[PDB]
Design an enzyme around this catalytic site. Sequence first.
Site, PDB file in Angstrom:
ATOM      1  N   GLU A  85      26.421 -78.780 -40.767  1.00 34.10           N
ATOM      2  CA  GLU A  85      25.944 -79.485 -39.882  1.00 34.10           C
ATOM      3  C   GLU A  85      24.063 -78.648 -40.303  1.00 34.10           C
ATOM      4  OE1 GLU A  85      27.006 -80.581 -36.558  1.00 34.10           O
ATOM      5  OE2 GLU A  85      25.845 -82.444 -35.868  1.00 34.10           O
ATOM      6  N   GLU A 176      18.556 -86.963 -31.445  1.00 34.99           N
ATOM      7  CA  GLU A 176      19.565 -86.816 -31.633  1.00 34.99           C
ATOM      8  C   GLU A 176      19.396 -86.726 -29.842  1.00 34.99           C
ATOM      9  OE1 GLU A 176      21.585 -83.910 -32.923  1.00 34.99           O
ATOM     10  OE2 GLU A 176      22.876 -83.569 -30.769  1.00 34.99           O
TER      11      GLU A 176
END
Length: 189
Positions: A85, A176
């Site tokens: 990620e 996010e």
Amino acid sequence: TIQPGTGYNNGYFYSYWNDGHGGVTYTNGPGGQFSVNWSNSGDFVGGKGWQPGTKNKVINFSGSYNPNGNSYLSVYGWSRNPLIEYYIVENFGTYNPSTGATKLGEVTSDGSVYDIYRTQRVNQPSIIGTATFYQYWSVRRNHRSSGSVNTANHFNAWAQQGLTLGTMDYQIVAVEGYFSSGSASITVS
Ligand SMILES: O[C@@H]1[C@@H](O)[C@H](O[C@@H]2CO[C@@H](O[C@@H]3CO[C@@H](O)[C@H](O)[C@H]3O)[C@H](O)[C@H]2O)OC[C@H]1O
């Protein structure tokens, strides 16, 4: 506004994921535009881009990003084999996500120095299920909410440092948030 999920909108892949806590809405707009509005959210990620990404994309973004609490604005994506990620963080709220992390170098790109870090997620959700995997970070020193990201400069610097990427999965400009509030309106190309 859409259900959490993935798909295509106006030529762009999108991903919108949340933890079900509530307090966040994600909206797909024309072309590469998306908006996020959140107030005492849980955990969430959403944005637009490509599926699959590439290792030499120049990603352009523009708009407004107004977090109140813990949030990031990044080029964000995954590789497979190895599972990674990764983040090229252009701006953030109350928390620098590299806090306490091992610094793995520096790279200059697109008008700023970035600091490079590696972290590890242990038995956490991922694109292939619960897993332990590394995360790679480039954290921009000079925060912004518009610009251009030459991803190759980051991926090449990471590779130089031993932070190798496998096959690219999705690659988006993402907002996010983690239990925070805010608003954002971003257009990608
Ligand atoms: O239906 C499945 C989807 O839920 C799944 O999506 C990925 C799940 O991992 C998500 O990543 C987290 C985001 O927040 C970070 O702080 C964490 O380390 C990440 O684990 C990712 O955003 C989703 O794409 O995709 C697979 C489907 O089967």
